[PDB]
Amino acid sequence: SDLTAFREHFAKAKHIAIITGAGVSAESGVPTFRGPGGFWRKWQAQDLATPEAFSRDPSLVWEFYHYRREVMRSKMPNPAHLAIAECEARLGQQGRSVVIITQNIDELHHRAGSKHVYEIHGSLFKTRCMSCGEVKANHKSPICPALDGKGAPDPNTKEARIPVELLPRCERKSCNGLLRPHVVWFGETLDSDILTAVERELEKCDLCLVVGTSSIVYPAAMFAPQVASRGVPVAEFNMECTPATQRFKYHFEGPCGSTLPPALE
């Protein structure tokens, strides 16, 4: 698959798109709460990250999202995040675009100094109002008083069972609607405006990077076929094996934080 081959493309590329998956947030120690042993109390993300869960028990879901807003205070961007950001900046000066398209909701790309980012699953640090629909940034710790010191991850921990009026509300006073995380739950659709934009960006691009996920799976699978059908190279950087015989074009196996920074220098 060869690094030099990749670097020759990288040198010439004027419009780079980098799609990032859970792997890159995992290297920063941010828990996914999915699959083997990633449990928050009795539940996993599948159970709590849904409209129904929120409608049924908005306290419990807000405990979950509060715990996750707070764990980010101690988790920092890994070198993949930074290498990307510094690349964007360096290339930008030269009149060369670098956009990030991320499934991750932790803002680690933003924290590493990336600017042109599309958070297709939203962000832990944005709220949406259930009444007026207003989307606003929110980095407050705690997000509201009632949740202070709540969200503890032990299967033991007693539910905070916060009254809905004391959960985060919409600060525009005529409204006072219940806020939810501005995030894409299971059973919800993506923003059409965001996908239209991403489509345009991937159509521009002449090098595409997949980092911390693969082309064959959501979300890369939506868009990689488009770029690939134009002859544009696609480089995967992730931790998955490649079969002995059927070597992938540009696949750099190993953790992003190691593989990516020398690729992008």
């Binding site: 739950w185 919800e188 659709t189 993506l190 923003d191 959501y218 939506m222």
Partner: peptide
């Protein structure tokens, strides 16, 4: 609109 993760 696109079901997040196509549903499964």
């Amino acid at each position: 609109x696109v079901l997040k993760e196509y549903g499964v």
